[PDB]
C-alpha cells in the first residue's frame, strides 16, 4: 500500500479488508506473501574470487582435457597399427569420472544449502502480530511479515516494516528516526492522515518507518510496505547489490586462491616442458604432436588432481552447522561474518546481574548444633543446591544428599524461615518460571523451605503453581501467626509471635521466631537448641558459632548470614508494646539459638567453569556491575575472576576512580582491569576504545539503548534475549540464555569452525603436494612414469571427494580452549604449517614413486629385479646386454603403476586420519571420533577395490589385481605417513606451544 500516510486508518484497513481486532486470515497471509514477498532486501550475488580463479578455472581444464582426449581419440583412428582398447575408451572414462565429480560436487552444494536453510528456524522472532488464528498476539519473524497484518509494537522495539499507525494504546508514542531523517531526538506520532501525498518522511508523523527505534509508548498499526518498498529499504538499496567489504579471512582465502592458481599452473607447464624430450618416444608412435598431446593430458590431469576443490561449500557447511550448534546452545549469531571474529575474542566484558549471577537470592549453606558436651559444641553443616527461586534442589551433608526430617533442628529451622517471612513464591505460567513475591532475602528462605521439605509432603505429583508454596503452607497450617514485630535498625532483626493452629489452648504453646544479623541475635540467646532439647549458651559454644559465621562471610563465597532463634517462653501479648520499635529488642531476649543460614547471589550455570575456560584460552574476563567496589571484588573472587587471596587495588575500578585518571592512565587501567563497578553507560564505550587500542578483539554485553553505542563499537556486540530490540540491532550476537556461559560456548564454537577449515586445507594441500612431487620425482630421476591421465583423475575423485568433505564434520578439538586467541593479522598458513605440508607431502610423493620403483629395484617375489640404472630406460632397446630373461616392455608393466596408484590412494586415506586434529595424537583423538570420515574412507576403498578386481575395470585404467601379499606391502609403506605426522604433531605440541 503506497501513500498510506495520505489515507486514513479506515481507508488503510479497507485496503486489505482486515479488522484490527482480528487480523489476516491464513488465505490472506498466503496470498500476500506470494504477491509481496518477504520483508527484506535481495541477497547480493556471492561470486567470490575463489570461484573465478579456481572453480571456473578448473572447469575450463576438464573441458580442454576432454578435448585433448577427443583429439587423440580421432588420431587413433588414423593409426594403421593394432586397434587398441584402453586408449579407445579414454574419452568415455574421463567423462564418466567427470560425471562422478559433478555428483560429489552437487552433494557438497546440497549439504551447504541445507545447512543454511536450517538456520532460518533459529531466526530471532522480532515482531508481534495479530492474525485470525489466535485471538492473542503472535511472535513472527520480521521477513515473514506481510502488508496487511496487524502489528503491535512497544518500548525498546525496532520497527519491523513500514506501518500505518491505527491506534496508540499509551498516552504518547515516541520514535527514534535518527537512522533516516537524522535526529536522535525522538519524534511524537499520531493516527491522523498526512494529506500531502508528496511529503517528506519528516512530515509523515503517522507512519512507523522500518529500522527506526520506538523511544516510548505502545501503539497498534497495519503494515503498508515491506522489503525493498521500504522507505529505508530504498535507502539501503544503495549498497544492496553493489558493495565492496570482504572479511579478513575472505581476503586471505582469495589471496591464497591466486597463489594456488599461479603455482599449479606453473608446475603443470613445468611437467609439459621437462618431458619434451619424451615427445618422440616409440610409445607415442614417434609423432611430436601425439607425444605433446599425451603430456598435455597429464599436466592438466595433474592440475585437476592438485586443485583443492569443495573449499567454498565445506567452509559454508561448517559455518552453518556450527552456527546451528550455537543457537542450539542459546547463542544466536545474526551475521555469519561475525563468527570468525567471535573465534578471535580476546576480551569479554560481561554484566553481572542476570548474566554472571542469577540475580535470585539463594541459601546455599546452613548449620545447626550437632552435640554439646563439656561447654563445647559440634555443628551440623549443610549445603543446598539450586541457584534460583524455583523449589528445585537438594540438601547435602558432606556432599551426600540427606533428608531434612532426619534432623529435629532442621525442622525448626524451616519453621522459622517459613513463619518469620512476609514474602512468598509464585509461578508465572506465562513466562514458565518461578518469581519472587517480596524481598529477595526473604524469598530465599521460602525457596529453602520448599527444598528442605521437613515433613516429606508428597509434591512430585503437584503442578508448578501448587508446588510454589507447598511446604510453606504445611507449616502455616500447624502454627498460626498472630502478629509481626517489624524490622528495627537498632537491633538488626525481626520476629513473629505464633501459636499452635486449631488449638483450644490459648496460652499454651506460643513461640517467637527471630531472624536477623548474627551478632545481635546470638547476643540475646541464653540457650542453645540441640535437636528438640536445649542447653544453656556457653562461651566456647558462642565463640564456635560466630567463628563459622565469620568464615562464611569472610571466605571466598562471602555469604550473607542470618541467625535464626526462638523464644521458647515469650511475653504475654497483653504485655507487649506494638507501636514502639524500640521496645521490640526487649521482647527478643532470652532466646534460644537454632541455626544459621548463608545466602548469596549465585553464579549462573557453568559460569565458574566458563571463566576458568577463558583463562585457559587466554581470554580476559571483565565484570561490569552496579555494586560497590568492595562487594564487586568479593563477587569476582566468588565466581573465579579473582583468586581467593589476590591483590585487586590495580585491577578493580569504580566509575569515580576511573574518571579521576588521565587518558593514558585510563587506557592503562583497561589493560589490566578485571572489574568495573558502578559505571556510567558512557564508560562502556571508553572501555572498548582503550581495549581496541591494544588490538584486543572485544566482546561487550548490553540490554538497553544506553548500551547500543558500545555494542556497535565492540567487535562482538552481545545483546540479551530479555533485553530491548534496539540493543539486539546494535549487536553481533543475542543471548537467549542471557548466560555468560553461552558467550564462552559461542567463542569455542567459532574457534572450532576455523580449525575444521585448517584441517581440511592441510589434508588437501599436503596430499596433493605429494601428487605433484610424485610426477616430478619420476621425471627428475628418470624412472618409468607411474601415473597416466585417467589414473590422475581417479585419485582426484577418490581422495579429494567424500573423505575431504567429511573432515568438515570433525568434532571440536581437545586443546581448543588451551590455546591463545587467534590474531586476525596472522597469515592463513604459518611457516611451520607450510613445513608440515611439505613434510607429509614430501613423503606421500616419494612413497608413491618408491613403491613403483620397488617393483623394479628391490623387487620381492615379482619380475623385473634391477637395482641398477632405471634412468636411461629408453636405452634398453639400444644396449640389450643388461637384462637377463626380461623384455624391455616390462618397464611398461601395469604392476608398478598399480602399486603407485594403490599406495597414493591409501596413504592419503591415512593422511585423512592425520587431519582429525591439528596437533593432537591419534592416540588421544581416535579414528572413530569421526564416523563420516571412516564411511568416506570405506567408500573410497570400496571404489578402489571395485576397479582392481572387477574384470572390465582394470583394463581401462591399465591396472592389475594386487596379491594379498602385495597389498600388505601397500599398508607397510602407506601407514608410516601417520607416524611422520605423529612426530610433527608431538613436536608442535611439546615445544612450539605449552
Ligand atoms: Ca583435485
Ligand atoms: Ca588428493
Ligand atoms: Na559491533
From Swiss-Prot:
Subcellular localization(s) per the UniProt record: Endoplasmic reticulum membrane; Sarcoplasmic reticulum membrane
Positions of Ca(2+) 1 binding: 304-305, 307, 309, 796, 800
Spans annotated as Interaction with PLN: 788-808, 932-943
Binding residue positions for ATP: 353, 442, 489, 515, 560, 625-627, 678, 684, 706
Primary location recorded for the protein, binned into one broad class: endoplasmic reticulum
Pfam families, A to Z: Cation_ATPase, Cation_ATPase_C, Cation_ATPase_N, E1-E2_ATPase, Hydrolase
Known catalytic reactions: Ca(2+)(in) + ATP + H2O = Ca(2+)(out) + ADP + phosphate + H(+)
A molecular-function term among this protein's GO annotations: ATP hydrolysis activity
Residue spans, topological domain Lumenal: 70-89, 274-295, 778-787, 852-897, 950-964
Cofactors (names): Mg(2+)
Keyword Translocase applies: yes
SMART domains tied to this protein: Cation_ATPase_N
Tissue expression profile of the protein: Skeletal muscle (at protein level). Skeletal muscle, fast twitch muscle (type II) fibers.
Topology, Cytoplasmic side: 1-48, 111-253, 314-757, 809-828, 918-930
Keywords: ATP-binding, Calcium, Calcium transport, Disulfide bond, Endoplasmic reticulum, Ion transport, Magnesium, Membrane, Metal-binding, Nucleotide-binding, Phosphoprotein, Sarcoplasmic reticulum, Translocase, Transmembrane, Transmembrane helix, Transport
Activity control: Inhibited by sarcolipin (SLN) and myoregulin (MRLN). Has also been shown to be reversibly inhibited by phospholamban (PLN) at low calcium concentrations in vitro. Dephosphorylated PLN decreases the apparent affinity of the ATPase for calcium and this inhibition is regulated by the phosphorylation of PLN in vitro. Enhanced by DWORF; DWORF increases activity by displacing sarcolipin (SLN), phospholamban (PLN) and myoregulin (MRLN).
Keyword field contains Iron-sulfur: no
GO cellular component: endoplasmic reticulum; endoplasmic reticulum membrane; endoplasmic reticulum-Golgi intermediate compartment; H zone; I band; membrane; perinuclear region of cytoplasm; sarcoplasmic reticulum
Membrane topology: Multi-pass membrane protein
Annotated positions binding Mg(2+): 351, 353, 703
Domain free text: Ca(2+) and ATP binding cause major rearrangements of the cytoplasmic and transmembrane domains. According to the E1-E2 model, Ca(2+) binding to the cytosolic domain of the pump in the high-affinity E1 conformation is followed by the ATP-dependent phosphorylation of the active site Asp, giving rise to E1P. A conformational change of the phosphoenzyme gives rise to the low-affinity E2P state that exposes the Ca(2+) ions to the lumenal side and promotes Ca(2+) release. Dephosphorylation of the active site Asp mediates the subsequent return to the E1 conformation. PLN and SLN both have a single transmembrane helix; both occupy a similar binding site on ATP2A1 that is situated between the ATP2A1 transmembrane helices.
PANTHER family the UniProt entry points to: CALCIUM-TRANSPORTING ATPASE
Protein purpose: Key regulator of striated muscle performance by acting as the major Ca(2+) ATPase responsible for the reuptake of cytosolic Ca(2+) into the sarcoplasmic reticulum. Catalyzes the hydrolysis of ATP coupled with the translocation of calcium from the cytosol to the sarcoplasmic reticulum lumen. Contributes to calcium sequestration involved in muscular excitation/contraction.
Record-given protein name: Sarcoplasmic/endoplasmic reticulum calcium ATPase 1
Amino acid at each position: 500500500m503506497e501513500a498510506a500516510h495520505s489515507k486514513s486508518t479506515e481507508e488503510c484497513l479497507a485496503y486489505f479488508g482486515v479488522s484490527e481486532t482480528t487480523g489476516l486470515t491464513p488465505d490472506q497471509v498466503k496470498r500476500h506473501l506470494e504477491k509481496y514477498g518477504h520483508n527484506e532486501l535481495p541477497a547480493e550475488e556471492g561470486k567470490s574470487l575463489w570461484e573465478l580463479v579456481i572453480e571456473q578455472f578448473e572447469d575450463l581444464l576438464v573441458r580442454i582435457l576432454l578435448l585433448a582426449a577427443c583429439i587423440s581419440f580421432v588420431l587413433a583412428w588414423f593409426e594403421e597399427g593394432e586397434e587398441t582398447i584402453t586408449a579407445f575408451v579414454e574419452p568415455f572414462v574421463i567423462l564418466l569420472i567427470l560425471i562422478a565429480n559433478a555428483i560429489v560436487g552437487v552433494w557438497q552444494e546440497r549439504n551447504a544449502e541445507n545447512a543454511i536453510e536450517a538456520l532460518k528456524e533459529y531466526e530471532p522472532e522480532m515482531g508481534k502480530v495479530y492474525r485470525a488464528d489466535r485471538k492473542s498476539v503472535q511472535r513472527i519473524k520480521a521477513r515473514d511479515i506481510v502488508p496487511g497484518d496487524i502489528v503491535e509494537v512497544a518500548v525498546g522495539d525496532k520497527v519491523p516494516a513500514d506501518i500505518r499507525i491505527l491506534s496508540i494504546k499509551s498516552t504518547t508514542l515516541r520514535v527514534d528516526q535518527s537512522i533516516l531523517t537524522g535526529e536522535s531526538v525522538s519524534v511524537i506520532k499520531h493516527t491522523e492522515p498526512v494529506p500531502d501525498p508528496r511529503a517528506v518522511n519528516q512530515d509523515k508523523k503517522n507512519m512507523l518507518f522500518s529500522g527506526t527505534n520506538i523511544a516510548a509508548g505502545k501503539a497498534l498499526g497495519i503494515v503498508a510496505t515491506t522489503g525493498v518498498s521500504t522507505e529505508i529499504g530504498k535507502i539501503r538499496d544503495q549498497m544492496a547489490a553493489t558493495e565492496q567489504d570482504k572479511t579478513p579471512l575472505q581476503q586471505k582465502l582469495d589471496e591464497f586462491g591466486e597463489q594456488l592458481s599461479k603455482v599449479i599452473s606453473l608446475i603443470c607447464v613445468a611437467v609439459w616442458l621437462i618431458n619434451i624430450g619424451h615427445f618422440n618416444d616409440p610409445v607415442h608412435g614417434g609423432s611430436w604432436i601425439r607425444g605433446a598431446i599425451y603430456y598435455f593430458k597429464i599436466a592438466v590431469a595433474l592440475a585437476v588432481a592438485a586443485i583443492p576443490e569443495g573449499l567454498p561449500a565445506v567452509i559454508t557447511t561448517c559455518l552453518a552447522l556450527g552456527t546451528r550448534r550455537m543457537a542450539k546452545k542459546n547463542a544466536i549469531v545474526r551475521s555469519l561474518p561475525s563468527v570468525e571474529t567471535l573465534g578471535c575474542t580476546s576480551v569479554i566484558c560481561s554484566d553481572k546481574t542476570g548474566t554472571l549471577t542469577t540475580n535470585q537470592m539463594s541459601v546455599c549453606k546452613m548449620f545447626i548444633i550437632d552435640k554439646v558436651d563439656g561447654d563445647f559444641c559440634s555443628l551440623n553443616e549443610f549445603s543446598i543446591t539450586g541457584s534460583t527461586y524455583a523449589p528445585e534442589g537438594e540438601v547435602l551433608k558432606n556432599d551426600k544428599p540427606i533428608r531434612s526430617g532426619q534432623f529435629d533442628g532442621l525442622v525448626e529451622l524451616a519453621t522459622i524461615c517459613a513463619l518469620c517471612n512476609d514474602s512468598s513464591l509464585d509461578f508465572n505460567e506465562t513466562k514458565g518460571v518461578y518469581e519472587k513475591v517480596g524481598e529477595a532475602t526473604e524469598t530465599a528462605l521460602t525457596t529453602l523451605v520448599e527444598k528442605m521439605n521437613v515433613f516429606n509432603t508428597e509434591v512430585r505429583n503437584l503442578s508448578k503453581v501448587e508446588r510454589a508454596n507447598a511446604c510453606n503452607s504445611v507449616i502455616r497450617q500447624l502454627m498460626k501467626k498472630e502478629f509481626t514485630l517489624e524490622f528495627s535498625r537498632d537491633r538488626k532483626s525481626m520476629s513473629v509471635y505464633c501459636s499452635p493452629a486449631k488449638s483450644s489452648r490459648a496460652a499454651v504453646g506460643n513461640k517467637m521466631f527471630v531472624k536477623g544479623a548474627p551478632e545481635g541475635v546470638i547476643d540475646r540467646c541464653n540457650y542453645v537448641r540441640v535437636g528438640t532439647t536445649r542447653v544453656p549458651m556457653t562461651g566456647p559454644v558462642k565463640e564456635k558459632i560466630l567463628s563459622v559465621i565469620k568464615e562464611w562471610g569472610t571466605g571466598r563465597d562471602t555469604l550473607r548470614c542470618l541467625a535464626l532463634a526462638t523464644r521458647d517462653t515469650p511475653p504475654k501479648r497483653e504485655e507487649m508494646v506494638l507501636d514502639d520499635s524500640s521496645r521490640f529488642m526487649e521482647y527478643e531476649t532470652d532466646l534460644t539459638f537454632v541455626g544459621v543460614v548463608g545466602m548469596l547471589d549465585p553464579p549462573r550455570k557453568e559460569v565458574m567453569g566458563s571463566i576458568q575456560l577463558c583463562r585457559d584460552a587466554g581470554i580476559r574476563v571483565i565484570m561490569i556491575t552496579g555494586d560497590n567496589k568492595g562487594t564487586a571484588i568479593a563477587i569476582c573472587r566468588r565466581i573465579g575472576i579473582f583468586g581467593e587471596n589476590e591483590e585487586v587495588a590495580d585491577r578493580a575500578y569504580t566509575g569515580r576512580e576511573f574518571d579521576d585518571l588521565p587518558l593514558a592512565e585510563q587506557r592503562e587501567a583497561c589493560r589490566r582491569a578485571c572489574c568495573f563497578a558502578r559505571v556510567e553507560p558512557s564508560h562502556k564505550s571508553k572501555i572498548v576504545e582503550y581495549l581496541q587500542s591494544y588490538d584486543e578483539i572485544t566482546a561487550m554485553t548490553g540490554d538497553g539503548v544506553n548500551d547500543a553505542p558500545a555494542l556497535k563499537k565492540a567487535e562482538i556486540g552481545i545483546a540479551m534475549g530479555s533485553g530491548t530490540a534496539v540493543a539486539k540491532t546494535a549487536s553481533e550476537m543475542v543471548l537467549a540464555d542471557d548466560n555468560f556461559s553461552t558467550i564462552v560456548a559461542a567463542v569455542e564454537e567459532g574457534r572450532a569452525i576455523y580449525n575444521n577449515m585448517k584441517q581440511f586445507i592441510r589434508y588437501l594441500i599436503s596430499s596433493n603436494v605429494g601428487e605433484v612431487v610424485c610426477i616430478f620425482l619420476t621425471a627428475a630421476l628418470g624412472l618409468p612414469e607411474a601415473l597416466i591421465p585417467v589414473q590422475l583423475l581417479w585419485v582426484n575423485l577418490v581422495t579429494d571427494g567424500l573423505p575431504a568433505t567429511a573432515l568438515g564434520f570433525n568434532p571440536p578439538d581437545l586443546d581448543i580452549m588451551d590455546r591463545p586467541p587467534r590474531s586476525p593479522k596472522e597469515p592463513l598458513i604459518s611457516g611451520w604449517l607450510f613445513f608440515r605440508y611439505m613434510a607429509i607431502g614430501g613423503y606421500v610423493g616419494a612413497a608413491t614413486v618408491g613403491a613403483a620403483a620397488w617393483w623394479f629395484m628391490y623387487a620381492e617375489d615379482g619380475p623385473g629385479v634391477t637395482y641398477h640404472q632405471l634412468t636411461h630406460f629408453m636405452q634398453c632397446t639400444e644396449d640389450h646386454p643388461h637384462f637377463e630373461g626380461l623384455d624391455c616392455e616390462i618397464f611398461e608393466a601395469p604392476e608398478p603403476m598399480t602399486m603407485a596408484l594403490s599406495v597414493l590412494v591409501t596413504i592419503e586415506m591415512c593422511n585423512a586420519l592425520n587431519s582429525l586434529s591439528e596437533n593432537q595424537s591419534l592416540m588421544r583423538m581416535p579414528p572413530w571420533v569421526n564416523i563420516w570420515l571412516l564411511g568416506s574412507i570405506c567408500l573410497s576403498m570400496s571404489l578402489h577395490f571395485l576397479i582392481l578386481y572387477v574384470d572390465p575395470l582394470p583394463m581401462i585404467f591399465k591396472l592389475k589385481a594386487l596379491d594379498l601379499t602385495q597389498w600388505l606391502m601397500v599398508l607397510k609403506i602407506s601407514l608410516p605417513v601417520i607416524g611422520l605426522d605423529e612426530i610433527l604433531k608431538f613436536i608442535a605440541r611439546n615445544y612450539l606451544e605449552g
